[PDB]
Amino acid sequence: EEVETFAFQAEIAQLMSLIINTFYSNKEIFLRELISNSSDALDKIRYESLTDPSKLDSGKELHINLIPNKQDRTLTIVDTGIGMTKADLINNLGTIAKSGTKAFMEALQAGADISMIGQFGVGFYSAYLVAEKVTVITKHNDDEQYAWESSAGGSFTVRTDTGEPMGRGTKVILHLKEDQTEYLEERRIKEIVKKHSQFIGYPITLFVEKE
Ligand SMILES: CCNC(=O)c1nnn(-c2cc(C(C)C)c(O)cc2O)c1-c1ccc(CNCC2CCCCC2)cc1
């Protein structure tokens, strides 16, 4: 193996129903959240590079790419952000899933708008509105490349990854549900990016396919 399995420390089930009962009607939100996460990690590497420019030896270009693949039924979002160590990976998709759900449910009960979801650290899980499964590949300067994977059931895996090296950053592959292929269409992606992510301060490039 060298594959490790972790049980969700929270009810990810409770998070998932909250996300359904909050965004099922506007699923395109997932793109906003993932792009927003990318921008966050890009801000971090930018910031660290100011004090230590050798942080950029793993890649100088700071960007976000979107890659639909109809044949595979995947939407992939790549960024050249700071990436996650193994511990960052578990902290951000596991640990925070518990405390961030708790925090976000409290704020919603007190009247906060749903659009705050990203601020409670659980925006990533909106991906499960469109994806049956999600793989996260990540690389941080201070660690090896890892692959995280979950169908948002009771568990997720982490493994040392041995695919193509990214130099630094994070790639999220959405294995879309059969009924949500619309997020593979160029026009659709474009509209969502225009609508939600126009103020993102890094270039966001859609890779259109040939047909
Ligand atoms: C420890 C240093 N590493 C990073 O922080 C990092 N590196 N890559 N990413 C990253 C993560 C995701 C999701 C899988 C969680 C992503 O879609 C894209 C990313 O670049 C991240 C990342 C980790 C967490 C988040 C979530 N931020 C919530 C935060 C809460 C307080 C308000 C401001 C925003 C967003 C991006």
Author numbering: 15 to 225
What does the publication say?
In this work, we present the structural characterization of hHsp90-NTD in complex with JMC31 through X-ray crystallography. In the hHsp90-NTD–JMC31 complex, the main moiety responsible for the binding in the ATP-catalytic cavity is resorcinol, a chemical motif shared with radicicol, a known Hsp90 inhibitor. The resorcinol is entrapped within the active site, where the hydroxyl group in position 4 displaces one of the three conserved water molecules known to play a crucial role in substrate binding. The phenolic hydroxyl groups, one nitrogen atom (N2) of the triazole ring and the amide of JMC31, establish a tight network of bonds with Asp93, Gly97, and water molecules, which are reported as key interactions for the inhibitor binding and activity. The resorcinol hydroxyl moiety in position 2′ establishes both direct and water-mediated interactions with the carboxylate of Asp93. On the other hand, the resorcinol hydroxyl moiety in position 4′ is involved only in water-mediated interactions with Asp93 carboxylate, Leu48 carbonyl backbone, and Ser52 hydroxyl moiety. The nitrogen atom present in the aliphatic linker between the aryl and the terminal cyclohexane forms a direct H-bond with Asp54 and a water-mediated interaction with Lys58. The terminal cyclohexane ring of JMC31 is exposed to the solvent. Despite these different arrangements, Lys112 points outside the active site when either JMC31 or other ligands are accommodated in the ATP-binding site. Our investigations are in line with what has already been observed for nucleotide binding, and confirmed that Lys112 in hHsp90-NTD, corresponding to Arg97 in protozoan parasites, does not intervene in the binding of this class of compounds.
